[PDB]
């Protein structure tokens, strides 16, 4: 019932600013402190500050004074954070979270990923992973999609628009020479493939791309 819905991923150049949102529902927005938390890989969790939307009172961890700015708009039931003078150290997942009453951070947003870089957005290239011509058969088969050369994060992969979730294995992205790659594999019954359409759906929010790759037997 209580929900905190944060805005989508952002790519930003060094020295610029970003403003992210946290829309609250299922409670009286103006009667609870909204806090912001920074998660940078290898830096645990860091408290930035909080705001009480009822009277606009704010507090900050000293280092974020003049760096992050917290606002709230009552009519929109939405809390905002604006972070200026962006550096690579500002690349992180940022969470909004509600405090109280007589409990601490009981409700969390899903997090907003910020990537600070001078590199422009690059959509992934997608290639099928298909068993070789001279491969040993069997009741099951493993198929996949190679997702290559994208920037920034993230990429999500689904199979058959989400209908195929069992036997799915998607490895973590790896960063190499400025670009990301990952791979997703699925093991399905030998009577489902090549009998049915097996598609991997590759989404890259930053480029607003929604790609499909049909997995088809090799050319005889």
């Amino acid at each position: 019932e209580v929900q905190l819905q944060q805005s989508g991923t952002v790519l930003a150049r060094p020295g610029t600013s970003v403003k992210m949102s946290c829309k609250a529902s299922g409670y009286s927005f103006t009667n609870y402190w909204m806090h912001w938390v920074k998660q940078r890989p290898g830096q645990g969790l860091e408290w930035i500050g909080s705001i009480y939307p009822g009277n606009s009172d704010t507090n900050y961890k000293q280092k974020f004074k003049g760096k992050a700015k917290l606002t709230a708009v009552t009519s929109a039931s939405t809390a905002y954070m604006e972070v200026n003078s962006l550096t690579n150290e500002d690349s992180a997942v940022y969470y909004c979270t509600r405090f109280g009453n007589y409990v601490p951070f009981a409700y969390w947003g899903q997090g907003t990923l910020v990537t600070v870089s001078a590199a422009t957005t690059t959509a992934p290239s997608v290639y099928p992973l298909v068993p070789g011509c001279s491969d040993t058969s069997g009741s099951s088969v493993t198929l996949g999609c190679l997702v290559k050369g994208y920037f920034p994060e993230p990429v999500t992969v689904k199979w058959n628009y989400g209908a195929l979730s069992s036997g799915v294995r998607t490895v973590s992205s790896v960063l190499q020479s400025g670009f990301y790659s990952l791979s997703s594999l699925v093991t399905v019954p030998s009577s489902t493939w090549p009998s049915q359409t097996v598609i991997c759906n590759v989404a890259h929010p930053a480029s607003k791309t929604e790609l499909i790759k049909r997995i088809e037997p090799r050319i005889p």
């Binding site: 645990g44 408290w47 979270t97 899903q110 011509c133 001279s134 998607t170 190499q176 791979s183």
Partner: protein, 214 residues
């Protein structure tokens, strides 16, 4: 600021066993210590607040203890669903501070990988690139070694290795090793082999193909 230190950054334990995750404060924080669990999708959940009080839908297996400077979250009998990263949090007053987290893995019965090898697709080849993928499926423990041989010779350059998160249901891992070459490099050789070395066997699991398709 109050420095929050967690006992260890990673922990591995068997199902049914008692698990303790520790946290220490640089000053006395009384009972103002909270525990959060983060899942691999980044979702954060409050489990324990005010040192020892359980929160919403938190199983009775969880308990909390504290002296004011030293704290721990205890799971009485580890369950499959307990996988994740656990963070402590002091909220005595601003500025709030957090522990750096303890990643909890399930210790599982040893499982050998199932290995698959994937030649480059015609689609990639026609565009000038060639990736060869070795996929190692559903193994435990996580530690695993992949060796590439091209025409019998070891290659280490242009290889990218990556793992899945531990399987939320059966606690296994999977991983892929991707060998990147140009089409011209790829067409200059015939045999493509990956050898998977895992503690489950002293002999490597070997998968190969010949570019000649024979």
């Amino acid at each position: 600021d109050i420095q929050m230190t967690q006992t260890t950054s990673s922990l591995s334990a068997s199902l049914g066993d008692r698990v303790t995750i520790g946290c220490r404060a640089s000053q006395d924080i009384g009972s103002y210590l909270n525990w959060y669990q983060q899942k691999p999708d980044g979702a954060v959940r409050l489990l324990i607040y005010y040192t020892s009080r359980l929160h919403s839908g938190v199983p009775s297996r969880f308990s909390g203890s504290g002296s004011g400077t030293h704290f721990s979250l205890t799971i009485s009998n580890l369950e499959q669903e307990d996988i994740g990263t656990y963070f402590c949090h002091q909220d005595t007053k601003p500025p709030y501070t957090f522990g750096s987290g303890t990643k909890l893995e399930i210790k599982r019965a040893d499982a050998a990988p199932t290995v698959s090898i994937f030649p480059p697709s015609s689609e990639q080849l026609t565009s000038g690139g060639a990736s060869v993928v070795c996929f190692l499926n559903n193994f435990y423990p996580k530690d695993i070694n992949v060796k590439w041989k091209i025409d019998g010779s070891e290659r280490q350059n242009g290889v990218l290795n990556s793992w899945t998160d531990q399987d939320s249901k059966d606690s296994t891992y999977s991983m892929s090793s991707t060998l990147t070459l140009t089409k011209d490099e790829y067409e200059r050789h015939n045999s493509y082999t990956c050898e998977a070395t895992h503690k489950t066997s002293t002999s490597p699991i070997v998968k190969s193909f010949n570019r000649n398709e024979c």
